[PDB]
Amino acid sequence: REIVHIQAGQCGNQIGAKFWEVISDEHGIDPTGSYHGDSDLQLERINVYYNEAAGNKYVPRAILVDLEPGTMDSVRSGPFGQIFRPDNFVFGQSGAGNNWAKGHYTEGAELVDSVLDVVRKESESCDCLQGFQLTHSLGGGTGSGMGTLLISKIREEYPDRIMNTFSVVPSPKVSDTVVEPYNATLSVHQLVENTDETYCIDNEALYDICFRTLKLTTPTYGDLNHLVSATMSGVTTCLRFPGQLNADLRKLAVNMVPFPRLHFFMPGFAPLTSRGSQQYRALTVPELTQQMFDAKNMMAACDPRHGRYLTVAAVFRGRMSMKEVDEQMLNVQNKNSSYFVEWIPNNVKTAVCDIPPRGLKMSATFIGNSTAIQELFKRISEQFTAMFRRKAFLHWYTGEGMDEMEFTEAESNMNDLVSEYQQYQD
Amino acid sequence: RECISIHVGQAGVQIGNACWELYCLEHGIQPDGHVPRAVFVDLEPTVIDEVRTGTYRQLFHPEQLITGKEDAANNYARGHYTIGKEIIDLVLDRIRKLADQCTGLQGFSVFHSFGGGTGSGFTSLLMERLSVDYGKKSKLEFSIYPAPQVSTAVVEPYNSILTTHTTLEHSDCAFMVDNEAIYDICRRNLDIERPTYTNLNRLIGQIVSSITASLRFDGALNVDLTEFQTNLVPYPRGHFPLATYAPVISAEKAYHEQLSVAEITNACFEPANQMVKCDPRHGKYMACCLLYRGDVVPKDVNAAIATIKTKRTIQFVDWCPTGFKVGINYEPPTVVPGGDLAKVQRAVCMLSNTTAIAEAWARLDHKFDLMYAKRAFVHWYVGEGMEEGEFSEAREDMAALEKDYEEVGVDS
Ligand SMILES: C/C(=C\c1csc(C)n1)[C@@H]1C[C@@H]2O[C@@H]2CCC[C@H](C)[C@H](O)[C@@H](C)C(=O)C(C)(C)[C@@H](O)CC(=O)O1
Numbered sequence: 078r079e080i081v082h083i084q085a086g087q088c089g090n091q092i093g094a095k096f097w098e099v100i101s102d103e104h105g106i107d108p109t110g111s112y113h114g115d116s117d118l119q120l121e122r123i124n125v126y127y128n129e130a131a132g133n134k135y136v137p138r139a140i141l142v143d144l145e146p147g148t149m150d151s152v153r154s155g156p157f158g159q160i161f162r163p164d165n166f167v168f169g170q171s172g173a174g175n176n177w178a179k180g181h182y183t184e185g186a187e188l189v190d191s192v193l194d195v196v197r198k199e200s201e202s203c204d205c206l207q208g209f210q211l212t213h214s215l216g217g218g219t220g221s222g223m224g225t226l227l228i229s230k231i232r233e234e235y236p237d238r239i240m241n242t243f244s245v246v247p248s249p250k251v252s253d254t255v256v257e258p259y260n261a262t263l264s265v266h267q268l269v270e271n272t273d274e275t276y277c278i279d280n281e282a283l284y285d286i287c288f289r290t291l292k293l294t295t296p297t298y299g300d301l302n303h304l305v306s307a308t309m310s311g312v313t314t315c316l317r318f319p320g321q322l323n324a325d326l327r328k329l330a331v332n333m334v335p336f337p338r339l340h341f342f343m344p345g346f347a348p349l350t351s352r353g354s355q356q357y358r359a360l361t362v363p364e365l366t367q368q369m370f371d372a373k374n375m376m377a378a379c380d381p382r383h384g385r386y387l388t389v390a391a392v393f394r395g396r397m398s399m400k401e402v403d404e405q406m407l408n409v410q411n412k413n414s415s416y417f418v419e420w421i422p423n424n425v426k427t428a429v430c431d432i433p434p435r436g437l438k439m440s441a442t443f444i445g446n447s448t449a450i451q452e453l454f455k456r457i458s459e460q461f462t463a464m465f466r467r468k469a470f471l472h473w474y475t476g477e478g479m480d481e482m483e484f485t486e487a488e489s490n491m492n493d494l495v496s497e498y499q500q501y502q503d
Numbered sequence: 504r505e506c507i508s509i510h511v512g513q514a515g516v517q518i519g520n521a522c523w524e525l526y527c528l529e530h531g532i533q534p535d536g537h538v539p540r541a542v543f544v545d546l547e548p549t550v551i552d553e554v555r556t557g558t559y560r561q562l563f564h565p566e567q568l569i570t571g572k573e574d575a576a577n578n579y580a581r582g583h584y585t586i587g588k589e590i591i592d593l594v595l596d597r598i599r600k601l602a603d604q605c606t607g608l609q610g611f612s613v614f615h616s617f618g619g620g621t622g623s624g625f626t627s628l629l630m631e632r633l634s635v636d637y638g639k640k641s642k643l644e645f646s647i648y649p650a651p652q653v654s655t656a657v658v659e660p661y662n663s664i665l666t667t668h669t670t671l672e673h674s675d676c677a678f679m680v681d682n683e684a685i686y687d688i689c690r691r692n693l694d695i696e697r698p699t700y701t702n703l704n705r706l707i708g709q710i711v712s713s714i715t716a717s718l719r720f721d722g723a724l725n726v727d728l729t730e731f732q733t734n735l736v737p738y739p740r741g742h743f744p745l746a747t748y749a750p751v752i753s754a755e756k757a758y759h760e761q762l763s764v765a766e767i768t769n770a771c772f773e774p775a776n777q778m779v780k781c782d783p784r785h786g787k788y789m790a791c792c793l794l795y796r797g798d799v800v801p802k803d804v805n806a807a808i809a810t811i812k813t814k815r816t817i818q819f820v821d822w823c824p825t826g827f828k829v830g831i832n833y834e835p836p837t838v839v840p841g842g843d844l845a846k847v848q849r850a851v852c853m854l855s856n857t858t859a860i861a862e863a864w865a866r867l868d869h870k871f872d873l874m875y876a877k878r879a880f881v882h883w884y885v886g887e888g889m890e891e892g893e894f895s896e897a898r899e900d901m902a903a904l905e906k907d908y909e910e911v912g913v914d915s
C-alpha cells in the first residue's frame with residue numbers, strides 16, 4: 078500500500094521539509110542519492126512514501142503548494158530540498174496574504190486544478206494506495222483555505238482512501254499571525270468533514286515540551302518541525318514494517334474515530350530525552366507508556382487531564398513483551414480509569430511494530446482522541462466571535478469574493494464539533 | 504484420513520506459524536527436506552509476507568499463501584463482505600484443490616482469532632463457504648478468544664460476536680484459547696516476564712501438535728477429530744471447548760519432571776493451566792477429553808480419573824455419567840530446543856467443554872452492548888456494507904448461546 082504527502086504552504090513546506098527529513102533518514106535516504114540503508118528492511122514498504130523512477134533515484138511521493146515563492150525556494154535551494162521532482166512543486170506568484178479566502182477562493186483556487194492534476198499523476202502511481210498525508214497550519218493562508226480546498230476536492234476523487242492531516246492549530250498563547258481565528262474556523266470547516274483523522278499540533282506545546290521535557294535553550298523551528306515529524310513519522314510509514322500486531326491509518330481511523338466526525342487527535346512521543354544530560358533511559362515499557370499518557374509531552378496545549386479519552390492508540394515499536402504492553406496499557410487504563418470513558422470497555426488500541434528509531438531502543442508514538450481537544454476547538458472559536466462582532470479583518474476575505482454567512486457557517490460547523498465532543502466527555 | 508488446516512489473519516497466520524513450526528519439528532524433517540497441508544490468508548500483506556520471507560518461507564507453496572493487497576482493518580464487516588470476498592472464492596478454490604488432493608480426508612483446522620479483522624469476519628465466510636460444501640465432514644477451529652482485559656483493537660467485541668455467530672452454525676468444535684490466560688501461566692508456571700507472541704503461539708503449537716498430530720498416531724485408544732466432537736460436543740451448537748495442558752513446566756524453575764501420571768492430571772483440572780481465563784467459576788464440564796501421549800499407562804490413567812472425578816469439587820455435569828473420552832498416544836512432547844518448556848516424558852492436552860466459557864462469552868458480549876449502545880464504531884461497518892440487523896442478530900444469537908451454555912447445565 079501507498080500514502081501520498083501534500084505539504085501545503087510555508088508551514089507545511091517547513092514541517093514537511095522536516096518530516097521528509099525524518100522519514101528519510103529512518104530509511105537511510107540521502108538528499109537525492111539512494112537506499113544507503115543501514116538496514117535491508119528500510120526498503121520494502123517504502124512504497125508507502127516513495128516512488129521508483131530512475132531506479133537508484135526515488136522521489137518522495139508528495140506535492141508542495143504555496144502562494145509566495147519565498148518559502149518553497151527556501152526548501153529546494155536548501156538542504157534536503159532537492160529530491161522532489163520539479164513538477165512536484167505547485168505555487169503562485171500571487172499575493173499569498175494570511176487570508177483564508179484567498180487561499181480557498183480568489184487565488185488558492187486558480188492553482189488547485191493544477192495541484193489536483195499533479196496528485197493523480199501520483200494517485201495512479203501503483204498498487205492500492207492507503208491514503209494522503211497533508212501537513213499544514215490552520216492560522217496562516219496558503220495552507221488553511223488552500224489546504225481545505227484540496228482535502229475537500231481530494232475526497233471528490235478518492236472517497237475510499239483514508240484522509241489524514243497534521244494541522245497546526247493556532248497556539249494558545251502567541252499567534253504568529255493576526256487573523257488567527259479567522260483562517261482557523263474557516264479551515265477545519267473543511268477538515269472536520271473531509272478528513273477522518275487529524276493530529277492537532279500546538280506550536281506552544283512543542284515549546285513547553287522542548288524546554289521542560291528537554292532542556293534545550295534555543296528551540297528553533299528545525300527542532301519543532303522535527304518533534305512533529307517523530308510522531309507524524311511513527312503513526313504512518315513506521316507502522317508499515319513487520320509488526321507483532323501491526324496497524325495502519327485504516328485500523329487507526331477504524332479504532333480512532335468512533336463517530337463519523339473524523340475527529341482530531343493529539344500526538345505524543347514517549348522516549349523524549351534531555352540532550353546529552355539524560356543518558357539514563359532504562360527505556361522499558363512502563364517508562365515508555367509512562368511518558369505518552371503524561372499530562373504534558375502532548376503536542377496540543379490541550380490538557381489530556383482536562384477531558385475523557387475516547388480511543389487512545391499508543392503505537393509501540395522496538396522488540397518488546399506484549400505481556401507488559403497489555404499490562405502497562407492496562408494498568409494505565411486502570412490506575413487511571415478516570416479519563417478513559419466507559420462506553421468503550423477497552424479504549425487502548427495497542428500496536429507493536431518491531432524495528433525502532435535508529436539510535437533508539439523502544440519508542441511509543443501516541444494518538445489520543447480525547448475530549449480534551451475541545452479545549453482548543455473552543456479556544457480558536459471564542460477568538461472568532463470576538464473579531465466578528467466588529468467584522469474586523471473581514472474585508473480581506475470579502476474583497477476576495479466571499480460571504481458573511483460562510484463565516485457564520487464554518488464557525489457553527491466547527492462549533493458543534495465541540496458539542497459532539499462534549500457528548501462523550503460526559 | 505487427512506486433516507486440512509486454514510490459517511487466517513495475523514493471529515491465525517501467527518499462532519499457526521508456531522503450531523506448524525513444532526509440527527515438522529516433531530516429525531524430524533528440516534526446512535525443505537514432503538509438503539505441508541494448509542493455506543494462509545490475509546487482506547493486509549506484511550504479516551503473511553513476514554512468513555514468506557523468513558523461516559519456513561519455503562515449506563509452503565505460494566498458491567496456499569493467498570494474500571490481499573487491500574486493507575484488512577480491524578472491522579469485521581470488511582473482511583466478510585466488502586473485501587474478504589475479493590479473495591475468498593480464490594481460497595475456497597485453494598482449499599478444494601487441497602480437498603480433492605488426497606485419500607478421503609476428514610475435517611478442517613481453522614486457526615484464526617475472534618477480535619480482529621481478517622480472522623474474525625473473513626474466516627466467517629470461509630467456514631460458511633466450507634460447512635456448506637462439506638457437511639459430510641468435520642470443522643474444528645481454534646478460537647483465540649479476545650482476552651478478558653488485556654485487549655488490543657477498540658472494536659474487539661464487535662468483530663467477535665458477529666464472527667462466532669456467523670460461524671457457530673457451521674464449525675463442529677471450537678477450541679478456545681485466550682491470550683491473557685496464557686500470559687497468566689508464563690509468569691506462574693514458567694517464570695518469565697518477557698513472554699513474546701512467539702511464545703504464546705508456541706504454547707498453542709503445544710496444544711495443537713496434539714489434538715491432531717498425536718491423535719493421528721498409534722496408541723492405546725486412538726482419537727480422530729470425529730471422536731472429539733462425537734464425545735466433546737453434546738449438542739448441535741458448534742460447542743467450543745477450552746484447551747489446557749499440565750506438563751506446563753518452567754524449564755529452569757522446576758528442576759523436576761518425573762512427576763507421575765496422576766499429578767499432571769491433577770494440574771489439568773486446576774484453574775491455572777487452563778488455556779482460557781475461563782476459571783471454572785461455576786462451570787460444570789460436560790465432557791473432558793484428556794489426551795495422554797508417551798509414557799502413560801492405561802491403568803494409571805484409569806485411576807488418576809477415578810479420583811479427579813470422585814474429588815467431587817471437580818463437579819461434573821449431572822446428565823453425563825462418564826465424560827472422559829480418554830486418548831493415549833505413544834510419543835511424548837518434543838519441546839522447542841531453546842524454548843522455556845522444560846519438556847517431559849508424559850503430557851495431557853485436556854481440551855474439555857465446560858459450562859465455563861459460559862463466562863467470557865457473557866463478558867465478551869457485554870462489551871458489545873456498551874459499545875453498540877452508542878453505535879460507537881458502527882458506521883465503520885455499515886459503510887463496508889452491513890445493516891443494523893447483523894449487529895442486532897449476532898447478539899440475540901449470543902443471548903441464546905447464553906440461554907444454552909448455562910441452561911444445559913446448572914440444572915439437573
Ligand atoms: C541533533 C539531534 C537532534 C536534532 C536537533 S535539530 C534536529 C532537526 N534534530 C540529536 C541526534 C538525533 O536524534 C537522533 C539520534 C538520537 C535519538 C535518541 C533516541 C535520543 O535519545 C532522542 C530521544 C532525543 O534525546 C532527542 C532527539 C529528542 C533530543 O533530545 C536529542 C538530540 O538532540 O538528538
Ligand SMILES: Nc1nc2c(ncn2[C@@H]2O[C@H](COP(=O)(O)OP(=O)(O)OP(=O)(O)O)[C@@H](O)[C@H]2O)c(=O)[nH]1
Nearest residue numbers: 512513514517575576577616618619620621622655
Ligand atoms: N495468541 C496470540 N494472539 C495474537 C497473536 N497476534 C494477535 N493476537 C491477538 O488476536 C487478536 C485478533 O487477531 P488479529 O491478528 O488482530 O486479527 P487480524 O485478522 O490480523 O485483523 P486484521 O489484521 O484487521 O485483518 C489481536 O487483536 C490480538 O489481541 C498471536 O500471534 N498470538
Ligand SMILES: Nc1nc2c(ncn2[C@@H]2O[C@H](COP(=O)(O)OP(=O)(O)O)[C@@H](O)[C@H]2O)c(=O)[nH]1
Nearest residue numbers: 086087088091214217218219220253254280298
Ligand atoms: N511548527 C511550525 N509552525 C510554524 C512554522 N512556520 C509557521 N508556523 C505556524 O504557522 C502559522 C502561519 O502559517 P503559514 O503556513 O506560515 O501561513 P501561510 O504561508 O500563509 O499558509 C504561524 O502562525 C505558526 O503558528 C514552522 O516551520 N513550524
